[model samples]
Target: RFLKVKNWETEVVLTDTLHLKSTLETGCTEYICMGSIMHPATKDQLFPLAKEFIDQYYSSIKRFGSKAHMERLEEVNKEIDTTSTYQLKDTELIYGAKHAWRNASRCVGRIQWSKLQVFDARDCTTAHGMFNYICNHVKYATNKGNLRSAITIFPQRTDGKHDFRVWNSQLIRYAGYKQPDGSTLGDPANVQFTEICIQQGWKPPRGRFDVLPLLLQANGNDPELFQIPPELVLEVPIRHPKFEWFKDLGLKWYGLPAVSNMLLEIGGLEFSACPFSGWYMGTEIGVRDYCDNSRYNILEEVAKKMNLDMRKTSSLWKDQALVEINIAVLYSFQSDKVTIVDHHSATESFIKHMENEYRCRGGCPADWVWIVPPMSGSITPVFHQEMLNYRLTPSFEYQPDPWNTHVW
Candidate 1:
């Protein structure tokens, strides 16, 4: 198996025989694929905050922001620019972040949207300060064994200097190393950034699930990767409930998947450095991560144990193995006392969330494809429930990566 880069970086995967013809090729043009796609809703969406700022602050110069905050808003609104000098209030920030979570169309677990713990870290000016804030967020969100949904927001955008950014998609993940034999050992998805970590003064152990460090930087500066302390990261080692040999595979996953690279827009403001997390649904790891041909690629491993024929495509051995694989993920997390919702329950809860939104907000948007789990799609309620997936303001959306930074 050979993975090579020509000109710049393009994804190529092939049958390990080193025949370039057999390789599956994919190239991500920065404008459409990565973070560069601007959400159409956010483009023309205008927040009423602009008018509120003018009314609240410049109400004749004497009527301004609350006591301590009066001066801060005053300086930014010297000309009463109203556009530039806006500050996020405690209640507003909390509600905005939570609304963003609920409005996240791809997530199936929006039932817990109101419970998200929002940490305001917008005061941090440098990389180190924001890094420390992330560490605390990791620990708090991990909650030892009981995972909780949370997000830590850094400073918003500024002129020339951008907002704080955490380079990793999640706070914790396995590091993949391109070995001397030209094979990757850990996570194939993280290969590029993992290589960047090795280059950035990090001496990674190069083992499976090595707990990749936090990559952080202040606006436009070089990002630094820092290894999360062993005690802070909690991982549930995967073991199949009925399959005895599964424990020997040494499979494990992080307790929380905290996505840090996406943009968190609340009331027309883009928080580029926000990291939010949720407990894993079974198929996210079992079917996709483990069964994807490029990742763990373990369908055959389980099929062989189940005594199924591999050569016959009609045998449906892959489908049979995927069920057990998903079973193992659910069993492991439940046994480990982690907070995870099963696919069925998640689907039911999503329906309830939509119904609640319908009653109160008149409509709730969702992507039926994403609302449904990876397996047993037709049987799930969400599969039949057509959703009105229109654009909503103050929502979480993907953004472009930082300039010149591969970690983004």
Candidate 2:
């Protein structure tokens, strides 16, 4: 039988990768995706966590200690004894992937946890192959703007010396350019990656909404660049419901939020290049992406256009502008037939998911700071709700930057 236990008190606690991505620059931009720090596992070191994972797997199916379950555990033990590592069955990986998202404490879209579509690309062995897989992931998840939540899992960390990785923070993103006047011409959050692309010989369009190219590294090779097909990427142009002038601002955003560089830890095995994606929430764009000073910083411009009194905070001009911008985001997406959720509805569904989680496990892990929307905290239901944040096995985690860990 799989047998092992861990001391909960001293276990390492890590920050949420997606949370850091979303809040990277004063909450500018809707869902940003990035890698995080990870401690790769070795052969002998994985048994304990692997054993616990096997136990959880059997227990989930109500087959704990059953004949087949015990035999499977023994099989894994023999496999580990001979090869110093073991593999998960296809069913195990599917459930483990979904379980990881369910344990994603910082995500408010956990209500859709069970609805994920997993694509296994573990057989892929080259950066060129990685691009084809990622392109397929983008097409499937985008689904012509009726977005679907999905994940594409690459190979696991075997030798730890050689590994596959996606260097882009997100599968789709806007480029950033530094202007001569000391102003950012595009999305400021992406300036670093944009510069990296330029150094790698990518031609700069110098456009505000230029879609970034994919950077993929295979078996620790130097990264390669591949531009995503424009037809495959769905973008929505921002326009207000009533304000005809809103369309003139020339604002636009890609429809999918595909986090391309996080690590997926499953039963002690680490997959360093699993890219997952989902639809967006309205406030993620309106309050964070458009209004944050580091991002578009459009609050003053929009307020001025609205003829609001910017001289005094008591005038509530910022708040008024916030609502209209958020409304424009929702209106634009709806008009384009894209998938999106407003904060109120998204939070309400999250609260329902939390209740269901508690009823099943007596507790649900959540980060209060992230669970609440960036724009209005006290007004949302999750703000009033208290939660406990803890780490769970078979979870998504941040891995170190590929360039930082790559060996020449």
Candidate 3:
């Protein structure tokens, strides 16, 4: 079925205008709708309606100072664009501002308190109101232990020019300057400033700054000269792990020495480097499906020595099968010089091989029965008596192994 049959109670319908109208109608006494009332259509409808209502309720006050009010109204109307002024009301503007503040406060409530000191006055202003409003709210909320510490702000670059000097000046003044009680807003014990620039491409800037980079000399390590205690210099950390996860599988030391050596040779290279280099030649060579009987015999001998019995325990055999199959596919791609093709075909082949080897045809076997099929085909059950018998019966049946019988 394209769509699953389910209960209707889980569904919800969403609409903006319907919701607003319903909220207003539901005895929400404080609710007020506002918009510009001067446009042609709105003027025809709302102006007369408003005039009639105001005349009926506020007739006594309307005639007193009506001339001065009309003059002031005319000036205010001239200041606003005609396109944007239609049906607008002061109460609606107030409601819009309050609604925005509610959403912002909810977001700020989720941040931690300890990290809150890093924000500058302008950052807080953009979030809530002007500088004074933000400062007062911060002091009040923080004293009550209800302030958020993790406010993030992204300042847009103006035109093609970035005023870094002005930006840094503001940051230092706000974050590092001492308060009336002599304690800094930001932690004096741990304060840092950094700057990064990219000449091209999508990478972020990569550099350090103390106050500003231009204040120091033009030398490569100018940032280091300005560094002081508690203001640690920035440096890029090591990118690669000391050891790889695949190393612990013991495949390199015992099962595939050539593959292991290849991994070691290129392990330290950057991730951007291509993998099919001269150092990986041995791994590349072994990935091919060699038609030679001698090569197959050598592989079987190595598998036997490693105690990888495909008929008995399927775990080790399955792993080896995957590795071998992957190598073969990689070899095929390399031979045809069609590396741009998606690797889905190779992955499908690998899955098919596993399904056949595990005797999981028709529906999947118990181990992988729940795994969704790779494509749109029904599962077929195919059983092999010899493989099953070898798997069910133990090879070391004669030996009363102490390790197997020993209590932990």
Best by TM-score: 2
Enumerate residue pairs that collide in model 1: 35-399, 35-400, 77-80
lDDT of 1 by residue, 188-275 (tens): 8889878777888888887887888888877657787677788888888899888898888788987788888888766446788889
Leading candidate by lDDT: 2
Q: For each predicted model, how many residue pairs clash, with residues at least 3 apart or on different chains?
A: 3, 3, 17
Q: Which ranges of candidate 3 are over 4 A from the true structure? A: 1-9, 18-73, 80-94, 101-134, 147-193, 196-408
| Model 1 Cα RMSD, 1 decimal | 12.4
Minimal lDDT window, size 10, model 2: 19-28
Q: Please give the TM-score that candidate 3 achieves against the real structure.
A: 0.19
Candidate 1, backbone clash total = 3
Please give the RMSD to the true structure for each candidate, in Å: 12.4, 8.0, 28.9
Off by over 4 Å in 2: 1-40
In angstroms, the error of model 1 at 58 is 18
Alpha-carbon lDDT of model 2:
0.84
**Candidate 3 per-residue C-alpha lDDT over 1-408 given as tens digits, one digit per residue, 9 for 90 to 100:** 111111123232111121111111211134542111111113333343333322322332355337644543454345323532222233322222222222121111111211222222222212122223323322432332222222111221122122111112121111122347754332232122221211112132221212222111111111111211112211111111222322232221001001000010000110110001001122222322121232221345334544577676655664464344334434433443322111233224324433342332111111121222222112311111111010110000111211222232
lDDT at 243, model 1: 84
Q: How many Å off is the CA of 90 in candidate 3? A: 9.2
Worst 10 residues of 1 by lDDT: 7-16
Using Cα atoms with residue i matched to residue i, what is each candidate's TM-score against the true structure?
0.81, 0.89, 0.19
* Candidate 2 C-alpha lDDT tens digits along 1-408: 211222133242222232221211222224752222123155577787778888989998999999978898888888888887888898889999998999887899999999999999988999999999999999999999889999999988888777889989999989999999999989999898899899998998999999999989888788899999999999999999999999999999888999988999888888999999999999988999889999988999999999999998999999999999999999999999999999999988987787677657655667677888988777787877766555677888888877777775
